[PDB]
Ligand binder design. Sequence first.
Ligand code: BDP
Ligand code: BDP
Lengths: 572, 576
Amino acid sequence: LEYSELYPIQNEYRMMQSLDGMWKFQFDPEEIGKKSGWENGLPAPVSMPVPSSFADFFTDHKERDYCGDFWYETEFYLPAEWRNKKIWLRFGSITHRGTVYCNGMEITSHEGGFLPVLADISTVAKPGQVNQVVVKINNELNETSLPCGATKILNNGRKLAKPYFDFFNYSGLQRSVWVIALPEESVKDYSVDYELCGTDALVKYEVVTTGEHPVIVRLLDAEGELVAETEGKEGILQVANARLWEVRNAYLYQIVILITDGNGVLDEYREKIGIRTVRIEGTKILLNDRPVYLKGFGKHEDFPILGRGFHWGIVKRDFECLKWTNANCFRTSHYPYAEEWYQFADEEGFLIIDEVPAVGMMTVPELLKSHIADTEEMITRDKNHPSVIAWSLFNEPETITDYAYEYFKEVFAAAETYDFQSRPMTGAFEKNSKPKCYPLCDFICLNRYYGWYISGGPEIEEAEELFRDEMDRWKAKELNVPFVFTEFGTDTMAGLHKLPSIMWSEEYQKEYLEMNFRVFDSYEFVQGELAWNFADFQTTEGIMRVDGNHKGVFTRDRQPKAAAVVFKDRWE
Amino acid sequence: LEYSELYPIQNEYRMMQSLDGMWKFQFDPEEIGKKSGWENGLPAPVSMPVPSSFADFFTDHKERDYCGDFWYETEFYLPAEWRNKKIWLRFGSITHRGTVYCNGMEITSHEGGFLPVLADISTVAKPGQVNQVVVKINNELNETSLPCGATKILNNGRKLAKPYFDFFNYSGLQRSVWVIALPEESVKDYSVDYELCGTDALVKYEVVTTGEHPVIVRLLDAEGELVAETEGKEGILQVANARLWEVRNAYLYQIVILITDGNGVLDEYREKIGIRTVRIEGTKILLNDRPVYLKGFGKHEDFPILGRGFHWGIVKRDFECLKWTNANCFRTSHYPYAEEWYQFADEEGFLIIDEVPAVGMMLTVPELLKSHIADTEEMITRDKNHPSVIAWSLFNEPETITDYAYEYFKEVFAAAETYDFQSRPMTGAFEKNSKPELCKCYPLCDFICLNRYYGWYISGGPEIEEAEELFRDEMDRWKAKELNVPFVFTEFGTDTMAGLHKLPSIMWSEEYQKEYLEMNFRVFDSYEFVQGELAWNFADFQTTEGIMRVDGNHKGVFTRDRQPKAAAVVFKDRWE
Ligand SMILES: O=C(O)[C@H]1O[C@@H](O)[C@H](O)[C@@H](O)[C@@H]1O
Ligand SMILES: O=C(O)[C@H]1O[C@@H](O)[C@H](O)[C@@H](O)[C@@H]1O
């Protein structure tokens, strides 16, 4: 990559300044902004919070449902002391695609709405003055970028997003924005990989910098004491009596990467990491050489009013709820999340399956290029989190064809080359993939709705029989790999009670889950269960979605339905 | 004040760095933190978002309901270039009271949970190094600080807050936190006041600095063009063809205050202001010499999970809802809000009644008065230069029928008048016990605000026809007093459970909310001196648990998520 994915920090060498707050904002239905000079300032803006999705602020349909080009602007004072630094704008994300301008000059463009965008403004920045940033954003969906969909044009020219996926097309500047300053020679990337040797551990590393000066790498324990030190852009740190990062029992070391010259340090990057190994062995998922059974949820970045807007408060509430259920895992369905989710998982000892936005899939070569780019960016961003134990490279694509296999072979090969740890890779399969892609997977993830979309309600005993039929077929294949159910659930309206239960009632959600557990527990090779979904979340409106998706175990406001205690008791 | 209330800005002379994020946090039930070195770092912290209220993150009762001492900590890197500046920690608020430590040193303490706390760390700050801030906070309620209440001790030593007010005792670091650097001689305060002269306007000003060097004051229009310039710490800016700040049609100039040192500048402060006048004339409220009728709501700082935690997203949604109802006003019931609420009201042309947290007051009175006056001074000093702020509310439903009460509020109002350069209208909200011929305090008020619940707490439901008669009987009594002042209803409403429908209506149904409002409007419109209506409440909000509160207060016209009940349209159509 032509930029660093490293999370920004502040020290003697690196500065950061938050651009979060109220930005200027303007819709551009006629696509006239660039030919009207909007990159020099918006002519009739309204105010827009950053970070946030723009949609749910407005009180009118057309602004909520806006699809097309729209623009952000803000101004910021740059300290004079940032002169002679490399100065970058860093967006947590820009959803879905955009072009970044600074002081009227085009800096960079990015396609993909759920990973950082870095814009080098070194040559146009004005230290000791007010500076301007303007972003042209587009939120249309197509079949050559992720996540896939279409754009419908109403007769009057108005655009409407048509997702091929079951979540609302939130967009805008949904994550934090910084302006940062780096030394002229800086740490650009690093990778760690772990080996356990009795009570000791090895931390294998590589460092990439923007120069040729020597690198020193130090490892500090949780109290800031030096436990290992070596020299070179590649090396091994030896840790005596290592304190391993364990499930729901984290321990974090701090890696410190220094660039030096003859007169001292040029750059210092530091980050918390956790010493842990992940391996698949037969039908077992091994964490630090011991089997672990995954227990948890698919989530979303979704909250009232803010949409997918990042807030630490949502992180905190959601993790308190996760711990209360006795969960140990979540999947970032269906896109990489804000970096802070992973930082916090590291602290709390949660396991993450990190998922690229490969949802709604079927121009194929262009789509593959986008898919691989998102994969590279995700892995480069997230590889050094101890919480990230697996990559999910798709959710319910087509998989019953020869070509599809060639496509995913390239995606998996790309993931392998970018992950220094070569950790387990997978993807979630829909039922259409009836018992050549699953061999690419290190473990198999199944999304199943036996008892909801298949033989629901009065037919639930038939659903159980059908479910067992399918699992008996998988069993007979004797693949000797772990199976994880990455989705299962029922739409459930809080307060809808019925005796006997009906589809959509709280009681049915409980009975459905009990049935699924009976099936899961009947097969040795099942090694995880992630319920769909942690919480009710927004979707496109329609005849099958009653104010979004209600398969949450929690409400959107993060309160438990009856079924929540079912998970709590089972996972205890 | 021993510090500046001015909102922090960043330029060549002033620096700022946000401390918002995940802080360290620890409860201190045994009150041993200061005995055990916690001011140098918490021994077993958990993570806590800032800004936010702490209560609603947890999944257990005892942490949610925690009452007593609790601590926050974070670390930050201070740029070497800040050396020998005046360096301050600035908390949007610390709820309710607290002591700020920096690098192990006690810096300042503050009582009052809804206004900025400034801590001067100039002598202990470590430029070019990592620094530590630790805050000891307490959220107990008592009768010598605002808002008033009690603290109950359960059998086992556990404390429980017992408010004398109808909102949940949210607390913590609920607003943004900054570390800032100021020049050694700086602009500490300024005040503006306006006079309209035909098509022109005068901006009268005063500037307070921490030194004796010359001051220059400039006014820029919305395009940044210079329209006026004057010299001195006191003066008048003459604005030709002034573009007035109008209700729901804002225009903002930028005031620029410079301290100069002959061949250079020592400090610069800039802030957006709006040229507007507000007066009471007979029974009318005049904005820029024209009558305005107030239309809107009492609000709260309240939102799912975040509690009172500040977020621009809540501001944006709430103002879009306000505009959709055709409102022009809200009251900051029952405490000053985060500064950003006023900044945005300035931009959107909304009128604000700014309210000090004087609720629950019904030998400790002398201390209470001191606290009340202090909060009043801080509120007015912080908020006076917002064009949106057109009135101060100095109480909500205290005792008012005794002579002691009159003497108490005389001193509060006198303090408020001393601190407001504009001498804009001062008021307070009266509950019904302050009967027309019993009340002693209304003469202090520039206009009178009434909270009334005829049709809810009095003769509700089947008796609503009686409620209306009782309401007219009281207003007839006020009318006969011929006070020649405007009356504003600052509260009226019914608890309403979204989705509860009944024909015929019942108390708590959406239909009854509509009928109650219609009855109230008929009464309002029968009296010429009524000059405003602020409904209680904009949105459902959290309260203490109890048999009278079904997951908080449901008198919202909007749900807590910010979606309209049936009655929202009633307001929209009437206020159009
Ligand atoms: O229909 C559903 O609830 C779900 O169906 C699954 O196939 C998708 O993976 C998921 O994102 C949907 O929300
Ligand atoms: O009972 C109520 O709903 C309200 O009563 C009024 O007296 C209070 O001023 C207000 O804060 C309460 O919420």
